[PDB]
mmCIF file of C-alpha atoms in Angstrom:
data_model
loop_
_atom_site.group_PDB
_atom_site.id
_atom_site.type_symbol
_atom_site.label_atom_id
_atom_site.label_comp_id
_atom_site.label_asym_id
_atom_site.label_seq_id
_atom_site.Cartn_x
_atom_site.Cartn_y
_atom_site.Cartn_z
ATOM 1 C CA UNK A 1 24.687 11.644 12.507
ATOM 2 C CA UNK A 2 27.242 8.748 11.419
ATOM 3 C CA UNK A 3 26.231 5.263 12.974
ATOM 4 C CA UNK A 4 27.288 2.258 11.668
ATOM 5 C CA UNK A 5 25.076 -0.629 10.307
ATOM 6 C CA UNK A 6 25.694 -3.097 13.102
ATOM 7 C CA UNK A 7 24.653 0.141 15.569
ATOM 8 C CA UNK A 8 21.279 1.001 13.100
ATOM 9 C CA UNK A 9 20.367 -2.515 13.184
ATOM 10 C CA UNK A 10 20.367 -2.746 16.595
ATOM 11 C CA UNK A 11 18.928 1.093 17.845
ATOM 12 C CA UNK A 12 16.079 -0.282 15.350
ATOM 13 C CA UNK A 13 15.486 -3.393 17.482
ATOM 14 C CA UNK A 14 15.834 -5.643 14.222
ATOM 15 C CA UNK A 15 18.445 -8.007 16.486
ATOM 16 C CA UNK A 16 19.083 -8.262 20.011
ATOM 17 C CA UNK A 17 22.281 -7.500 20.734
ATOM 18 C CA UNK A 18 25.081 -4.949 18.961
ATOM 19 C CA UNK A 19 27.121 -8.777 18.308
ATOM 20 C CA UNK A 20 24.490 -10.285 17.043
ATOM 21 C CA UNK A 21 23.949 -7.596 14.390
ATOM 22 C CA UNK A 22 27.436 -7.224 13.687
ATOM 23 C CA UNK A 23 26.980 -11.044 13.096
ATOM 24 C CA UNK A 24 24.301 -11.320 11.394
ATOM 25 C CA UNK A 25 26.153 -8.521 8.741
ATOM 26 C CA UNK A 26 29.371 -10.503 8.491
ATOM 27 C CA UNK A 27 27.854 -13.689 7.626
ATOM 28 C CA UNK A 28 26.370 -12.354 4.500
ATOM 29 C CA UNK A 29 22.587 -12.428 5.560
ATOM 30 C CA UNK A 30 21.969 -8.614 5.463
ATOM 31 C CA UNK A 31 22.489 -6.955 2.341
ATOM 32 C CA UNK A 32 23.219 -3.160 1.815
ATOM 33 C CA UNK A 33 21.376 -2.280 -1.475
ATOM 34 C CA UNK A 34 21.338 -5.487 -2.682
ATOM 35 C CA UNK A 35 24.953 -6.052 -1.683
ATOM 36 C CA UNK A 36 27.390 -7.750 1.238
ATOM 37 C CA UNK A 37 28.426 -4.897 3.108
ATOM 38 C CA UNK A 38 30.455 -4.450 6.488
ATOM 39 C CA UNK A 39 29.074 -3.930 9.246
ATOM 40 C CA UNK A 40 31.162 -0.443 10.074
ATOM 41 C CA UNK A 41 29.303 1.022 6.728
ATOM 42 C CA UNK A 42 27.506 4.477 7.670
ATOM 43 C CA UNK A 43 23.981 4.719 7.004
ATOM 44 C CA UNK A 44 22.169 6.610 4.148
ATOM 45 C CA UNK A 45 18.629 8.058 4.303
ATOM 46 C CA UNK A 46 16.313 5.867 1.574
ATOM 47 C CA UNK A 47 18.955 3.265 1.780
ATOM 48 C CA UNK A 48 17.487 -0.643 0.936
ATOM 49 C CA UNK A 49 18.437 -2.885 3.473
ATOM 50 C CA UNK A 50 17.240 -7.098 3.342
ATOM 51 C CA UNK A 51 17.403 -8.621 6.228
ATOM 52 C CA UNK A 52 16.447 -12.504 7.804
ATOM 53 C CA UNK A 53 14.644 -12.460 10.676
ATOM 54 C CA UNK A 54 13.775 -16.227 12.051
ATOM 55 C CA UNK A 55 12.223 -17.411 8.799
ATOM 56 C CA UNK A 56 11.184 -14.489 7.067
ATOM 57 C CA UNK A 57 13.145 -11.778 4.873
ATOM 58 C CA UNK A 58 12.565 -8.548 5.179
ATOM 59 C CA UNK A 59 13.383 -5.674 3.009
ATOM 60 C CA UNK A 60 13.242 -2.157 4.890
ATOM 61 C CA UNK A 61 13.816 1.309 3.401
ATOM 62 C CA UNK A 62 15.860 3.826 5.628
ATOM 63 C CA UNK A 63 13.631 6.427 6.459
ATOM 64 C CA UNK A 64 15.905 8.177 9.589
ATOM 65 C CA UNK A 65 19.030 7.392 11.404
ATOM 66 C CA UNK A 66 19.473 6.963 15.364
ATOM 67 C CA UNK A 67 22.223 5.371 17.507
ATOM 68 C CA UNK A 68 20.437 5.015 20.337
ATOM 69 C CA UNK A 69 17.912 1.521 21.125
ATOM 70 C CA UNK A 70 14.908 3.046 22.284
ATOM 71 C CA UNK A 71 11.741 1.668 23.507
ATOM 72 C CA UNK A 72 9.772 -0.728 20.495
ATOM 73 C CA UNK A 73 7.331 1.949 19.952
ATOM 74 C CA UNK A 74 9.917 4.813 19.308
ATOM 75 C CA UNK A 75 12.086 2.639 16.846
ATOM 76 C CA UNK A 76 9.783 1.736 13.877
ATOM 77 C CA UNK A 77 10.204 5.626 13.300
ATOM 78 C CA UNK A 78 13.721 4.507 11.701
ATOM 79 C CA UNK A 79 12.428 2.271 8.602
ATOM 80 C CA UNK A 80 9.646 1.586 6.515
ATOM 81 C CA UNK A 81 9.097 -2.269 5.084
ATOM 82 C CA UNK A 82 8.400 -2.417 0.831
ATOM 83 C CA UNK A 83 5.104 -3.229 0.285
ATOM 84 C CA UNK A 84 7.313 -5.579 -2.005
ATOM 85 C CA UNK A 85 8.243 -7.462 0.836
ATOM 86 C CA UNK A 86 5.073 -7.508 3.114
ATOM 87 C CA UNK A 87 2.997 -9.403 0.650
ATOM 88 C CA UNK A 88 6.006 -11.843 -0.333
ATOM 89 C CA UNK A 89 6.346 -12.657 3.668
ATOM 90 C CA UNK A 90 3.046 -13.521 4.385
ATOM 91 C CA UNK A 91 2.758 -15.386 1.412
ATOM 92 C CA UNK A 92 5.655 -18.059 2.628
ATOM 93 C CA UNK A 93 3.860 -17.410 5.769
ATOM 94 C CA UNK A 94 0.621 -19.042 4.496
ATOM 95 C CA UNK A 95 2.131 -21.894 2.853
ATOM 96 C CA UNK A 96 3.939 -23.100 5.933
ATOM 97 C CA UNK A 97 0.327 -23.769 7.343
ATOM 98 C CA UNK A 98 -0.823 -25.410 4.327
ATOM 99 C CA UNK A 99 2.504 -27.394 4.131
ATOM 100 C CA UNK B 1 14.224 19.590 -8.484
ATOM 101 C CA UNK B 2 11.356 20.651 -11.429
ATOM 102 C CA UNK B 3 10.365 17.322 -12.853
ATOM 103 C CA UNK B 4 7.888 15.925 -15.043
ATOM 104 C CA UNK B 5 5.244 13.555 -14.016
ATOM 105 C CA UNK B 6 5.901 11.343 -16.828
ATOM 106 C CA UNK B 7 9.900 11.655 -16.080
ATOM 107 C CA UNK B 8 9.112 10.859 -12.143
ATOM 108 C CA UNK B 9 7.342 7.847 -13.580
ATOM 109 C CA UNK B 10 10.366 6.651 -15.556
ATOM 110 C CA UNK B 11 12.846 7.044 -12.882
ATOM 111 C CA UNK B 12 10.347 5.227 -10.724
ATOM 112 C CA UNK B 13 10.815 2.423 -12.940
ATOM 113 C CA UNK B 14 7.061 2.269 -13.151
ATOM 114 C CA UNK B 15 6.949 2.577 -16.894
ATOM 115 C CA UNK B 16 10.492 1.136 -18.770
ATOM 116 C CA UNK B 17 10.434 4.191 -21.252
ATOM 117 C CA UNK B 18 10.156 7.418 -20.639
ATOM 118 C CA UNK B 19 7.493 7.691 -24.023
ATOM 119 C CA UNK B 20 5.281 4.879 -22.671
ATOM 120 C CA UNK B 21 4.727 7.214 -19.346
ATOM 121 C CA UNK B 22 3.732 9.949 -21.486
ATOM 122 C CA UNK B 23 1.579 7.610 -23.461
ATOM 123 C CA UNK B 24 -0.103 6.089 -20.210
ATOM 124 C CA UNK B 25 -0.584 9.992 -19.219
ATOM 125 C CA UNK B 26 -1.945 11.292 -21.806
ATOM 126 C CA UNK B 27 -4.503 8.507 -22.009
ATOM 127 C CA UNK B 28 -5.539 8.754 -18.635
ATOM 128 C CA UNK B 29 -4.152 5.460 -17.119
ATOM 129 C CA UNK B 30 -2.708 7.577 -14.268
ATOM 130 C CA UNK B 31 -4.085 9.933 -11.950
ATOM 131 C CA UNK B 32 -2.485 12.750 -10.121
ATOM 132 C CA UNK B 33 -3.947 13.581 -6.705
ATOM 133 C CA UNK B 34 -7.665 12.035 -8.162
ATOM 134 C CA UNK B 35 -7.318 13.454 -11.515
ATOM 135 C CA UNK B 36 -6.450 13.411 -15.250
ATOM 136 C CA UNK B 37 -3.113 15.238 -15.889
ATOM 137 C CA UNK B 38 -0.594 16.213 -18.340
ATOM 138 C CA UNK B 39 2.410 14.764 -18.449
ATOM 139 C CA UNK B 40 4.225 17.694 -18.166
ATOM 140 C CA UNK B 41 3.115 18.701 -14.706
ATOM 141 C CA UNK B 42 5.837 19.212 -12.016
ATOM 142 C CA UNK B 43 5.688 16.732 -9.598
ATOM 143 C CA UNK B 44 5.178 17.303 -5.701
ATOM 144 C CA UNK B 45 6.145 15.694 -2.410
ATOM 145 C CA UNK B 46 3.238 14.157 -1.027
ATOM 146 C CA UNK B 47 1.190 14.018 -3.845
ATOM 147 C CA UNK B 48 -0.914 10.901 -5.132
ATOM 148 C CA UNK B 49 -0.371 8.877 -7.864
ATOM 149 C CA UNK B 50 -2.874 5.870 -9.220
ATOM 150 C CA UNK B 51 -1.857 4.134 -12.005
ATOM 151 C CA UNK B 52 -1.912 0.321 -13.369
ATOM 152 C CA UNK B 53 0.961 -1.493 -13.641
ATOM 153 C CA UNK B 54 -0.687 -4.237 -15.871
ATOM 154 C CA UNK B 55 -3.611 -5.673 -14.318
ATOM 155 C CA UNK B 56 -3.237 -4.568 -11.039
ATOM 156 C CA UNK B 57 -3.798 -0.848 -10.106
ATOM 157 C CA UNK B 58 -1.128 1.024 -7.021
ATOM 158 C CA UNK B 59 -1.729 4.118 -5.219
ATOM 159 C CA UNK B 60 1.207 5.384 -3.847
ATOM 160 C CA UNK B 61 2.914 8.431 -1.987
ATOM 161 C CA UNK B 62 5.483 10.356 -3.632
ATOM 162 C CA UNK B 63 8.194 10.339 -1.101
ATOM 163 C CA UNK B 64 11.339 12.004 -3.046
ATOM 164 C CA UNK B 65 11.660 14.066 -6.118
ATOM 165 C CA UNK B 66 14.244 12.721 -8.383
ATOM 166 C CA UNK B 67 14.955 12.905 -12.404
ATOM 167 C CA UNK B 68 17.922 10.271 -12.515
ATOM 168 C CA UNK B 69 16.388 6.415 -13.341
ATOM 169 C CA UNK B 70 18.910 4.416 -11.615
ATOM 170 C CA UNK B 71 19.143 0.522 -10.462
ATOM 171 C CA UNK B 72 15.869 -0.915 -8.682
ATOM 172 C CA UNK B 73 16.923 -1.324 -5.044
ATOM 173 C CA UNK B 74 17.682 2.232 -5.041
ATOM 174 C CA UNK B 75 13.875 3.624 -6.994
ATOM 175 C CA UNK B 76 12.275 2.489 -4.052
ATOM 176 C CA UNK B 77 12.931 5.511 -2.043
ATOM 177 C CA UNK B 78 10.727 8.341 -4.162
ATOM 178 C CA UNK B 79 7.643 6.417 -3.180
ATOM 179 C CA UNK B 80 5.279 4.231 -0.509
ATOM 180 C CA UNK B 81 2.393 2.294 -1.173
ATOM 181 C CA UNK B 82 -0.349 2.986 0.828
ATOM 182 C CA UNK B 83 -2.016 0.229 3.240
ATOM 183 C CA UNK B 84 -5.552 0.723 1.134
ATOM 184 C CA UNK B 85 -3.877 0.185 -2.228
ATOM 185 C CA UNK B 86 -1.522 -2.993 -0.553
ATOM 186 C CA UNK B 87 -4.804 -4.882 0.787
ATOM 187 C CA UNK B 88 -6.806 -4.311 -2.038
ATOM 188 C CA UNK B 89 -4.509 -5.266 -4.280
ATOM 189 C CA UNK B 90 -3.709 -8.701 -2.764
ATOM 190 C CA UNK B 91 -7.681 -8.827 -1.997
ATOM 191 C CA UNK B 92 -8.280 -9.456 -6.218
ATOM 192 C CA UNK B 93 -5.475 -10.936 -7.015
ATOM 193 C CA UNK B 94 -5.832 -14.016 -5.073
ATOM 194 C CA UNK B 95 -9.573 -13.805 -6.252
ATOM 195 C CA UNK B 96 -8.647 -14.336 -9.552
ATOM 196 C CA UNK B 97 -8.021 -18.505 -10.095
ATOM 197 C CA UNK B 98 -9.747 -19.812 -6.986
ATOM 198 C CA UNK B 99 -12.616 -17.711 -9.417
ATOM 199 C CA UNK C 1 3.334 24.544 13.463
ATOM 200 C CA UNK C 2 1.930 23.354 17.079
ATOM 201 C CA UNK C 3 -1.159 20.644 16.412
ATOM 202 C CA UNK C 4 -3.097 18.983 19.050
ATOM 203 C CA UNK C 5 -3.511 15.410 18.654
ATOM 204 C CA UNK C 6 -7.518 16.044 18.627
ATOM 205 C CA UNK C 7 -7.022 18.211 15.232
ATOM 206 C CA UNK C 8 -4.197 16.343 13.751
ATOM 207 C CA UNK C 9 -6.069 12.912 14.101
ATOM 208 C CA UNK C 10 -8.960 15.051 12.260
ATOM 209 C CA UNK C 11 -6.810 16.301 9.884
ATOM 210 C CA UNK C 12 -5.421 13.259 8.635
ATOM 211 C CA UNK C 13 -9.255 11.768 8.624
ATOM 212 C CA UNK C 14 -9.422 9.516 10.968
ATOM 213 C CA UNK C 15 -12.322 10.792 12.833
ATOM 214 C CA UNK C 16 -14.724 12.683 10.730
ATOM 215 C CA UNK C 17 -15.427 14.956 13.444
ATOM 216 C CA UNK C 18 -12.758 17.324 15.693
ATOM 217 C CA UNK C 19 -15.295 16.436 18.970
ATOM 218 C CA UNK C 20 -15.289 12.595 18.156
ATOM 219 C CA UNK C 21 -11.534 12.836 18.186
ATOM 220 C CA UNK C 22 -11.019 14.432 21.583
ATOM 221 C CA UNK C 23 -13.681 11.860 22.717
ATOM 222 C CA UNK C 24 -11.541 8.935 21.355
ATOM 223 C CA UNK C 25 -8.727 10.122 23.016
ATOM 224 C CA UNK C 26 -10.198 11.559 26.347
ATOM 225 C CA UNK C 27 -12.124 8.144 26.835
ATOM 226 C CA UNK C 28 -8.730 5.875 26.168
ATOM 227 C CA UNK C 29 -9.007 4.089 22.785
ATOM 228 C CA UNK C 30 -5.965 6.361 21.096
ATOM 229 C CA UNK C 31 -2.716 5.465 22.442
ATOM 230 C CA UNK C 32 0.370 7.965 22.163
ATOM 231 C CA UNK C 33 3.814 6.096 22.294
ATOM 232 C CA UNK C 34 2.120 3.035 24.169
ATOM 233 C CA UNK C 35 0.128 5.431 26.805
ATOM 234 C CA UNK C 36 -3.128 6.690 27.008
ATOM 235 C CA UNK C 37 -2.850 10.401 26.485
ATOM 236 C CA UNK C 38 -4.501 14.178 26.645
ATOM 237 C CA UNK C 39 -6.360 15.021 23.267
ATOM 238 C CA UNK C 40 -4.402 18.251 23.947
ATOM 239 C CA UNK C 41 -0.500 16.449 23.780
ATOM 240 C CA UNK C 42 1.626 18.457 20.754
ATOM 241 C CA UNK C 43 1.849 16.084 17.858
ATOM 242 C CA UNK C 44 5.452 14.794 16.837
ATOM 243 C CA UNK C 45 7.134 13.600 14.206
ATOM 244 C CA UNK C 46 7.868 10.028 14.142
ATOM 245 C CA UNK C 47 5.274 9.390 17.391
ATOM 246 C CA UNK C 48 3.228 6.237 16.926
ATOM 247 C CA UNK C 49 -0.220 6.580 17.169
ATOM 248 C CA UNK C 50 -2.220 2.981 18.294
ATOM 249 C CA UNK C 51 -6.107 4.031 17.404
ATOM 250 C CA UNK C 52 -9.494 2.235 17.236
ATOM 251 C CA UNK C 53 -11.474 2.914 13.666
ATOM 252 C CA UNK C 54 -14.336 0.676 13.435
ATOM 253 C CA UNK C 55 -13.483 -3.661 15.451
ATOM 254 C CA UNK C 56 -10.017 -2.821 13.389
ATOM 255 C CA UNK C 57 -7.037 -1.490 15.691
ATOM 256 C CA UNK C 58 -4.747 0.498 13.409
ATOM 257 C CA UNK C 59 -0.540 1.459 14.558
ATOM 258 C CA UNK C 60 0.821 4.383 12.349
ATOM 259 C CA UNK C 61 3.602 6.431 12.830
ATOM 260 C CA UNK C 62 3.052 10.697 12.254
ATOM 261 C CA UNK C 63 5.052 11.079 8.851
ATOM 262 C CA UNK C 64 4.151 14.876 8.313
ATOM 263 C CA UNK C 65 1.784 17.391 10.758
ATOM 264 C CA UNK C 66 -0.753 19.728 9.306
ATOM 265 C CA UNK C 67 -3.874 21.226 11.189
ATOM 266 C CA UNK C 68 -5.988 20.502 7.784
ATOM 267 C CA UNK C 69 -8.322 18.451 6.896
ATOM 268 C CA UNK C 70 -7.809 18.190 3.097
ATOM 269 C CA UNK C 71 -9.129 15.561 0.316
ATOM 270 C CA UNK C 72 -8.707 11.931 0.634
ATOM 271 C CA UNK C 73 -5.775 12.432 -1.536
ATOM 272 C CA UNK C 74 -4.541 14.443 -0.114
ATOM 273 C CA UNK C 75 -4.449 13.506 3.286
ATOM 274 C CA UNK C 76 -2.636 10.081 3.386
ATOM 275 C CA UNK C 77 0.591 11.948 3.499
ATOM 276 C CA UNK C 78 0.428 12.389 6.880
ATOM 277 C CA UNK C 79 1.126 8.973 8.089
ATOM 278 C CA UNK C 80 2.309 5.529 7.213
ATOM 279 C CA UNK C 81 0.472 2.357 9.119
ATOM 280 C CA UNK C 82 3.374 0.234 10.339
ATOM 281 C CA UNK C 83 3.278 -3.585 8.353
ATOM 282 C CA UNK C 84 2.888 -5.480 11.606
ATOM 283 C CA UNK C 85 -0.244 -3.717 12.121
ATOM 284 C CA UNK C 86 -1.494 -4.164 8.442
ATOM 285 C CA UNK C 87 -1.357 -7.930 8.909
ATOM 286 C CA UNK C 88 -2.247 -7.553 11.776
ATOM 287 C CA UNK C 89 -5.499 -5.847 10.643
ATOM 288 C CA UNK C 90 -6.169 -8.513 7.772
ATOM 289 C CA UNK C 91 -5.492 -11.264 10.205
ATOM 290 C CA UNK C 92 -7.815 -10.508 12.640
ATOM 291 C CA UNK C 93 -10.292 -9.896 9.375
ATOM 292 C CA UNK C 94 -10.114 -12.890 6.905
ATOM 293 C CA UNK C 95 -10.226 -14.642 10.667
ATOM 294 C CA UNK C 96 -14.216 -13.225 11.069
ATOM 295 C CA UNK C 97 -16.408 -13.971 9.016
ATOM 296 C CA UNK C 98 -14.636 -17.173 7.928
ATOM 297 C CA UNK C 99 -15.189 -18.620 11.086
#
């Protein structure tokens, strides 16, 4: 019921390992509602979280919290991506092939 | 928890004003569930809404009920764009200066 | 409410028919979770669903379950298709016919 961001980020296979979430948080390139944040901060439901994964950024809504890493196709149950973001990620996608 | 369609729209931050989202109502710029509507109807969960948001026209899902208008990253949560309205809307906007 | 997967994939109007559905699952091209499955497994909550339309392969996770087939509008609550599989879905397409 209370899991921290470090733990979300990682039960919803986003990085790796637990470290490199916690990381990933401390180093300033996930943002909490368009914020730093620790990476013990508890979860909210319809929370926005931005996130860099390799080259893209990624902004994800909260949809359900989980503390446990499950298999990949019982873990995209946790978040939904803003359409926001999908369209602005395969945009810089494109124009690395056009480069 | 009883809020009006127009009022869902302004804390939605789809219309800056709460009078332009009765305006855009009331002259059937936005449709609820398929439909013309007042803009006094009481919003559902679940329910449909097309409207245009300048050129462009969204579909989306209403995901939360809420009357408070409050900072962007956190509007995001009453509402998810369906993958119909996403595609289509990238599919004329990039059709419009290649033209 | 207890929904097979052959009336909820009908419900949300994926197949047009309740018989085509249990087809498309009884003859392998819906996948439950990753796993081919019985047209008669209970429907959950947060499942993912991996499903054949037309040469498109669509991944959606089970956002709400209802055993009725409503409108168009009214429908597309049921589900959310994951954005991996939406570009996924436009990649294989703008890929066809440009070739």
């Amino acid at each position: 019921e209370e899991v921290r961001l470090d733990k979300w980020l990682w039960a919803a296979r986003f990085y790796k390992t637990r470290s490199l979430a916690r990381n990933m948080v401390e180093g300033g390139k996930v943002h909490y509602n368009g914020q730093r944040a620790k990476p013990s901060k508890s979860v909210e439901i319809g929370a926005q979280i931005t996130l860099r994964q390799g080259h893209d950024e990624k902004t994800i809504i909260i949809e359900k919290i989980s503390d446990q890493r499950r298999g990949a196709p019982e873990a995209q149950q946790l978040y939904r991506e803003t359409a926001k973001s999908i369209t602005k990620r395969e945009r810089n996608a494109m124009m690395r092939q056009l480069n």
